[PDB]
Amino acid sequence: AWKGEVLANNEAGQVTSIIYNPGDVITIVAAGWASYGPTQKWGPQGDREHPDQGLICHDAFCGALVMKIGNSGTIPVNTGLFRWVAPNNVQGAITLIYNDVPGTYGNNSGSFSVNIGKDQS
C-alpha cells in the first residue's frame, strides 16, 4: 500500500510506490483541499464550475486528482476508486497529478492526502 501527499503546485506529479500490473484490482481514497490559484479551495473532485482551458486531464474538473499509469494518458481519480481495474494494456508506476493547465501550476496551493493499496484479485 502507498500513502503520501500530492501537492497541487507539483506540476510533474507525485510518483508513488505502486506498480499497477495486468489483472490488478486497486482502491484509492483521496482527501483534502487544494486550489489552482483562486483563494477558495476544492476537494479532489475539483471545481465543477470551472471551464476547461487545456487541463492535463479533460475528463475531470480543473483542480481534481488525476493519475497516470506508466505511459498512459491521464485518468481521473477524484475522491478515489473502489476495487478498480485499468483498461487493457495500461500498466506501470502510478503517478498522481493535480489537474491544472500546463505551465499554470505555480500559483497553486494545498494538497491531497492519498491512500492506494492493492485488493484481493
Ligand X SMILES: OC[C@H]1O[C@@H](Sc2ccc3ccccc3c2)[C@H](O)[C@@H](O)[C@H]1O
> Which residues are within 8 A (CB) of 38 and not within 5 positions of it... i.e. 6 or more apart?
none
Binding residue (CB under 5 A) for Ca ion from 32, 37, 70, 92: 37
Find the part of the chain contacting its own copies (CB under 8 A) among 12-20, 45-53, 67-75, 94-102. Answer: 45-53
Q: 39 or 88: whose CB is closer to ligand X?
A: 39
CB of 103 to its own copies, least distance (A): 27
Distance (Å, rounded) from C-alpha 33 to C-alpha 36? 11
Binding residue (CB under 8 A) for its own copies from 4, 80, 91, 93: 80
Q: Of 75, 93, 100, which is closest to residue 2 (Cα–Cα)?
A: 93
Distance (Å, rounded) from C-alpha 30 to C-alpha 45? 9
Tell me how many degrees the CA angle 35-37-42 measures, rounded to the nearest 5.
20
For residue 78, state whether it binds its own copies (rule: CB under 8 A). Answer: yes
Q: Could you list the residues that contact its own copies (CB under 8 A)?
A: 1, 27-31, 33, 40-45, 48-49, 78-83, 115, 117, 120
